[PDB]
Design an enzyme around this catalytic site. Structure first.
Site, PDB file in Angstrom:
ATOM      1  N   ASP A  59       1.046  -1.128   0.244  1.00 49.53           N
ATOM      2  CA  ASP A  59       0.229   0.041   0.089  1.00 49.53           C
ATOM      3  C   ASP A  59       0.846   1.401  -0.268  1.00 49.53           C
ATOM      4  OD1 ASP A  59      -1.980  -2.064   0.801  1.00 49.53           O
ATOM      5  OD2 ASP A  59      -2.239  -1.228   2.250  1.00 49.53           O
ATOM      6  N   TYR A 339     -10.103  -9.479  -2.901  1.00 57.93           N
ATOM      7  CA  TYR A 339     -11.041  -8.443  -3.381  1.00 57.93           C
ATOM      8  C   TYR A 339     -11.724  -8.359  -4.502  1.00 57.93           C
ATOM      9  CZ  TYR A 339      -9.144  -4.978   0.615  1.00 57.93           C
ATOM     10  OH  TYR A 339      -8.228  -4.434   1.804  1.00 57.93           O
ATOM     11  N   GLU A 358      -9.624  -9.734  -7.747  1.00 56.97           N
ATOM     12  CA  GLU A 358      -7.838 -10.166  -7.690  1.00 56.97           C
ATOM     13  C   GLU A 358      -6.577 -11.882  -7.612  1.00 56.97           C
ATOM     14  OE1 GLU A 358      -6.858  -8.558  -3.863  1.00 56.97           O
ATOM     15  OE2 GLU A 358      -6.654  -6.026  -4.402  1.00 56.97           O
TER      16      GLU A 358
HETATM   17  K   LIG Z   1      -4.479  -1.535   3.694  1.00 51.68           K
END
Ligand SMILES: [K+]
Length: 379
Positions: A59, A339, A358
């Site tokens: 991230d 996800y 994903e």
């Molecule tokens: K996260």
């Protein structure tokens, strides 16, 4: 059965001046994709957004928002960058975590996409709670009114309403898709990190708008849990469906976001096991009834691999739940997995149910329309 939307280590993007973006995948490709969001138009056009994490799955890395457009039912995709990061920090500048809406905004069919933006923060957003809001944070909104061909920034008051609230350090969309209510109102589910003096670190809520320019926050908050969430409209309620370690949570508001209470037909019905995962929740009409369709991971290894991304139906009347299809029956990549995003429409007499998800750093698409009779029965 599946098309590849974005291939890990297999895409080359260009920047605003037209120069290639040399990522860390083989051959200078983008290394990894995460966090898909899909919106389908009245023309049948499918637009899929995802983080193009050019260097690493982290991230806290260099990320742009990619967009893939298909006009052939998901067989082929035209790809571009929809939103570029600010290019302050070659390691950390990022636009990320998309939520999209397709809506008729005062007659004009529009695709909205909302993403968080950071530059110099080297940690995740929960680490920054001293300011109202964090100076490194923003929440930006882009729109397309040409059926997904071009996207342009929308000037909003979203940053302003967060500052005015005074108890929010950062805010994101709920991830996947938002909604347009029957009355026309635009609604993004949101997740927020509260300032340090607030006992609850995370909350869920929504922002709403008529024109897509001026937005509002309701006065109340829902408990945060794992904070990623989606909202559905059901009679005079807005109902959320929230990530949580173990059993997913679902609350309803009957006063437009002042107070929330548990929603029994969805609360605690699906188990995502350790850590939880984002999930996508939408409604599908069945006569003048509604059914909720939901996707998230069974997580058979009880860890960050988030195996077996599955489609469920929730009977909104009886509370029954059933597994419809384990559409990605595979152990995911623990660097970032699990996800998904659903998209349903009825265009003329043609009903479509699509999913993106994903898959080992890539984003895949499936047409799940064959499951519609089973889902619609579940009322
Ligand atoms: K996260």
């Amino acid at each position: 059965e599946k098309s590849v939307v974005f291939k890990a280590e297999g895409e080359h993007f260009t920047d605003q001046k037209g120069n290639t973006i040399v990522g860390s995948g083989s051959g200078g490709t983008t290394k990894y994709f995460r966090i898909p969001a899909m919106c389908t138009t009245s023309k049948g056009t499918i637009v899929v957004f995802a983080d193009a994490r050019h260097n690493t799955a982290s991230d806290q890395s260099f990320i742009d928002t990619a967009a893939a457009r298909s006009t052939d039912g998901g067989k082929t995709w035209n790809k571009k960058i929809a939103i570029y990061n600010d290019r302050v920090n070659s390691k950390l500048s990022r636009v990320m975590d998309p939520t999209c809406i397709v809506a008729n905004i005062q007659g004009r069919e529009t695709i909205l996409v909302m993403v968080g933006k950071w530059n110099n923060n080297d940690k995740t957003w929960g680490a920054y709670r001293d300011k109202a809001p964090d100076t490194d944070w923003d929440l930006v909104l882009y729109k397309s009114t040409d059926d997904g061909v071009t996207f342009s920034k929308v000037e909003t008051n979203i940053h302003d309403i967060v500052t005015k609230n005074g108890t929010i350090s950062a805010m994101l969309g709920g991830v996947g898709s938002g909604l347009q209510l029957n009355d026309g109102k635009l609604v993004f589910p949101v997740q927020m990190v509260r300032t340090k003096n607030i006992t609850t670190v995370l909350n869920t809520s929504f922002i709403y708008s008529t024109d897509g320019i001026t937005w509002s926050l309701p006065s109340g908050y829902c408990e945060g849990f794992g904070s990623e969430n989606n909202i559905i409209e059901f009679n005079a309620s807005l109902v959320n469906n929230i990530r949580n370690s173990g059993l997913r949570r679902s609350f309803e508001t009957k006063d437009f976001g002042k107070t929330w209470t548990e929603f029994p037909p969805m609360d605690k019905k699906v188990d995502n096991r350790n850590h939880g995962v984002q999930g996508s929740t939408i409604t599908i009409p069945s006569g003048n009834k509604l059914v909720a369709a939901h996707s998230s991971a069974q997580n058979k290894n009880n860890d960050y691999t988030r195996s077996d991304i599955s489609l469920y139906a929730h009977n909104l009347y009886s509370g029954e739940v059933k597994l419809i299809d384990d559409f990605y029956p595979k152990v995911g990549n623990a660097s970032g997995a699990g996800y998904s995003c659903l998209s349903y429409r009825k265009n003329v007499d043609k009903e479509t149910l699509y999913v993106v998800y994903e898959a080992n750093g890539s984003i895949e698409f499936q047409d799940l329309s064959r499951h519609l009779p089973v889902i619609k029965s579940y009322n």
